[PDB]
Design a protein around this nucleic acid. Structure first.
Ligand code: MG
Ligand code: MG
Ligand code: MG
Ligand code: MG
Ligand code: MG
Ligand code: MG
Ligand code: MG
Ligand code: MG
Ligand code: MG
Ligand code: MG
Ligand code: MG
Ligand code: MG
Ligand code: MG
Ligand code: MG
Ligand code: MG
Ligand code: MG
Ligand code: MG
Ligand code: MG
Ligand code: MG
Ligand code: MG
Ligand code: MG
Ligand code: MG
Ligand code: MG
Lengths: 141, 135, 204, 155
RNA sequence: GGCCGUAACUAUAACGGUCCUAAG
RNA sequence: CAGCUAGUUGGUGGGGUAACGGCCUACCAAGGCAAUGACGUGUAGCUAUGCUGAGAAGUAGAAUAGCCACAAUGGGACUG
RNA sequence: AUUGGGCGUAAAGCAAGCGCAGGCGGAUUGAAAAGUCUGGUGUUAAAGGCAGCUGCUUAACAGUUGUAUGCAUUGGAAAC
RNA sequence: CAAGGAUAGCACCGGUGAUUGGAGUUAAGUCGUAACAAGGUACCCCUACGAGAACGUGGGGGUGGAUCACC
RNA sequence: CUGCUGAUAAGGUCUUCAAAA
């Protein structure tokens, strides 16, 4: 796939993606691109699994020195998205660590909470099933 | 503000001041030191009795007294009653309060507990004014 | 310790002791709020606080209860499992003198309380003098024997008019009680559950 | 049986060439206690006509409310101007923990047990706007299932 | 450089009137 | 309240202490702490807890219980 | 106002810049495991709090059983 | 070795003090009319000088200024 | 087409109410 515009990204990997997603949702935009990091790749994989996005697709330069991830939002026929809001918890500076006992439940289970405990990012329900917790990245509902 | 900013300079809470400061000063009288011990009501001795004029809207002559307490503070105190036996030199027992008309007055005199006589000719709300039950 | 103007209180609240004996009366059939200022306007639009207080007063005057006792019972019931709208009703109705009234051995609730205080009532396996003991369905509350010969025993033993939730085994005055009273047996004098919310606010 | 209750009766006025024109404004909340509730604010020279117009507006603008087990499904914050109202689900038994305009709206809508708190201003019209926004923004647990292709709220 | 009058307890005069001088 | 500290910091031999130790001693060195708050001033027994708060926490350290210090003020020591 | 506030006109962006220390910080690989998560062990005195029960005519109250939090050590996890 | 006593100069804190400076509060005091409209000399900010007093004027800066006006 | 043009003692009513027809 060929591009024309330069691609930049913020230094904060969770909130960069969150800002991109929120702006695309508010502006009804469908496809967005950003620089690819492995945390972002895993988080997009779990978003696609949970069904908040249509597809995410990683690409590499011809010299294998740069990688960028482009993803599309899942709009219905009447063009209203599945994402309703995003809020980041573990911002730089103040990192949020919660044990299993205090693993949050987002919107009474309607939304999902992204938790990167020890096996990569992990949804709240599967984290509860595994009885182990860790860093809490963002709230998506 | 910012986590680092609050870590460096934490939140300082605004102070709280009392409404009747003169009732919380105790003078030892042997070492001559004043300590901050809270007391509900305190005994004082009057120096000058008279009348003052209420501030803007009200118009009257309200009975005040310059009373010096058991400590070394002299306060202007309103006598709550109709008619008084204060004779410019007597022992009274002040409690907290605040009459809105007279500026600077922030205490009241309990009626009918000590040298100051009670308020007779009263059958309603007399327990506040120190009046014996008619029976 | 109770008011001596139950007529006045019944006329104010509007609800009597479920018999209308203090409303029918022998004079004037008065069903207005007492005092000179009884026949005036501004009837409805009672505030939320006003109606909550009125309902609470009706509830805690229907049984002759002091508000502090009401707070005590509510603090007792509140902690258990969950929604106890079926438990706190039994708690409120389980009074000993109240059980004596629904037994039918006294003309009035406070007269039954007076008899209980004076000691003409027994219990399952003990004796009771205080008219506030919390009871549980199953205790054989057998009446006294020397009180069955008192010049005022006729209406006492005329208990054939009895509530279904107090079972006496008539002519034996055994007077136990099972099948706790339902909201049907607790008439429309006070049938509300936001007095619970009022005591939830005013009592932690 | 669309019950109605008066929330606020203000005495607004304008100034003319000599004197003041005074009109009463009423804020009425109309609800059937089954899922339909609206609000209406009206002004008139007299209280009866003001109430009539306010009830007419409230019945003209009715909104549909969905309840889950007698309560609100998920915690929400309704924003309207400087008034922010926080609603939180409650178990069956706590009753209405609301007071004032929020309490009127919740009772007339039909909810049984709700935790509420007014975090902002205390003007009844804006508090009602915030409460209505919070209840309207609510998501059922079937719309989210349809959106995310889950199985009717199954895990 | 003078003189006279003047403020809602008294007291005083912020203020006002006027004569003269090169200027007070 | 921006400098404080000269047994203060460190080394050698000996003494003293139930014990290690500038605890003390004689000799040789100039170090030690301090803007991540020394030092100075003010105040206070500390804690389990009491009261309050949805919670984070605010406030008092009743009664009682653990520990510390004192016995008119200031020093010394015997017995054990 | 960490949870939980703001700085155009209502209190609040230093007159502007060069900037040490501090805070934050691009992408990938390896190691260790200081933070983070989790298992075992020791301890966190008794009384107090909450839940259950018994005894005082019921209660207040007394008694009885259960009931956390943090620290240390040891054994694993490696996403940040 | 050493509590205490005497003598001596520094250090910090407290009370009070003739006289004096300003401040707040005060139903109906005197002198002016500085500001709010183009407030009758547009106002405001920094600054220097001067005057019974609000304030006046010079220097720089702003619109948080009225009228004006264009088919 | 720009003369001059200063001041006005104190405290105060006035919305009773919609429950409803
Ligand atoms: Mg005219
Ligand atoms: Mg709070
Ligand atoms: Mg103690
Ligand atoms: Mg003590
Ligand atoms: Mg002594
Ligand atoms: Mg010995
Ligand atoms: Mg604010
Ligand atoms: Mg400002
Ligand atoms: Mg600037
Ligand atoms: Mg500035
Ligand atoms: Mg730079
Ligand atoms: Mg640097
Ligand atoms: Mg990185
Ligand atoms: Mg313990
Ligand atoms: Mg106990
Ligand atoms: Mg002017
Ligand atoms: Mg001017
Ligand atoms: Mg002059
Ligand atoms: Mg000049
Ligand atoms: Mg100028
Ligand atoms: Mg000139
Ligand atoms: Mg002229
Ligand atoms: Mg004048």
């Amino acid at each position: 796939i060929t591009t024309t515009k330069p691609i930049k990204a913020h230094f904060d990997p969770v909130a960069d993606l969150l800002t991109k997603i929120n702006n695309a949702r508010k502006a009804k935009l469908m496809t967005v691109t950003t620089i690819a990091s492995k945390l972002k790749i895993a988080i997009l994989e779990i978003l696609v699994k949970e069904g908040y996005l249509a597809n995410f697709q990683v690409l590499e330069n011809k010299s294998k020195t740069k990688r960028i991830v482009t993803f599309n939002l899942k709009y219905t026929q009447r063009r209203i998205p599945s994402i309703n809001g995003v809020k980041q918890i573990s911002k730089p500076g103040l990192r949020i660590y919660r044990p299993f006992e205090k693993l949050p439940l987002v919107l009474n289970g309607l939304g999902i909470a992204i938790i990167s405990t020890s096996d990569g990012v992990m949804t709240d329900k599967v984290a509860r099933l595994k009885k182990i917790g860790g860093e809490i990245l963002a709230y998506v509902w | 503000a910012t986590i680092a900013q609050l870590i460096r300079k934490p939140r300082k809470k605004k102070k709280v001041k009392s409404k009747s400061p003169a009732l919380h000063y105790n003078l030892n009288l042997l070492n001559k030191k004043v300590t901050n011990v809270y007391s509900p009501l305190k005994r004082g001795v009057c120096t000058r009795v008279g009348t003052m004029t209420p501030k803007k809207p009200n118009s009257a002559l309200r009975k005040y007294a310059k009373v010096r307490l058991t400590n070394g503070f002299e306060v202007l105190t309103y006598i709550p009653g109709e008619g008084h036996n204060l004779q410019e030199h007597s022992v009274t027992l002040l409690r907290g309060g605040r009459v809105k008309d007279l500026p600077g007055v922030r205490y009241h005199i309990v009626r009918g507990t000590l040298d100051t006589v009670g308020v007779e000719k009263r059958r309603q709300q007399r327990s506040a004014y120190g009046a014996k039950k008619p029976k | 310790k109770y008011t001596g103007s139950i007529f006045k209180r019944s006329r104010r609240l509007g609800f009597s002791l479920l018999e209308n004996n203090k409303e029918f009366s022998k004079g004037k059939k008065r069903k207005t709020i007492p005092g000179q200022h009884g026949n005036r306007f501004r009837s409805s639009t009672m505030s939320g606080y006003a109606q909550q207080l009125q309902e609470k007063q009706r509830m805690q005057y229907m049984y002759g209860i002091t508000d502090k006792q009401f707070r005590r019972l509510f603090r007792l019931v509140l902690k258990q499992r969950g929604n106890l709208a079926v438990n706190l009703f039994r708690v409120l109705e389980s009074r000993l003198d109240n059980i004596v009234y629904r037994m039918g051995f006294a003309p009035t609730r406070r007269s039954a309380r007076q008899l209980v205080n004076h000691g003409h009532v027994l219990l399952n396996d003990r004796t009771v003098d205080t008219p506030s003991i919390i009871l549980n369905p199953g205790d054989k509350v057998r009446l006294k024997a020397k009180t069955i010969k008192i010049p005022i025993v006729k209406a006492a033993s005329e208990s054939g008019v009895v509530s279904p939730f107090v079972e006496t085994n008539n002519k034996t005055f055994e007077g136990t009680y099972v099948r706790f009273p339902e909201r049907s047996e607790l008439p429309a004098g006070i049938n509300e559950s936001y007095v619970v919310e009022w005591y939830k606010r005013l009592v932690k | 049986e669309f019950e109605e209750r008066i929330v606020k009766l203000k005495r607004i006025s304008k100034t003319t060439k000599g004197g003041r024109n005074m009109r009463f404004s009423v804020l009425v909340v109309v609800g059937n206690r089954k899922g339909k509730i609206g609000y209406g604010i009206a002004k008139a020279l007299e209280v009866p006509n003001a109430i009539k117009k306010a009830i007419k507006a409230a019945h003209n603008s009715l909104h549909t409310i969905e309840i889950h087990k007698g309560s609100i499904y998920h915690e929400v914050i309704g924003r309207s101007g400087a008034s922010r109202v926080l609603l939180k689900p409650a178990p069956q038994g706590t009753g209405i923990i609301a007071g004032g305009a929020i309490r009127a709206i919740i009772e007339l809508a039909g909810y049984s047990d709700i935790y509420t708190k007014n975090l902002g201003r205390n003007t009844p019209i804006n508090m009602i706007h915030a409460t209505m926004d919070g209840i309207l923004k609510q998501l059922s647990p079937r719309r989210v299932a349809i959106l995310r292709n889950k199985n009717l709220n199954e895990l």
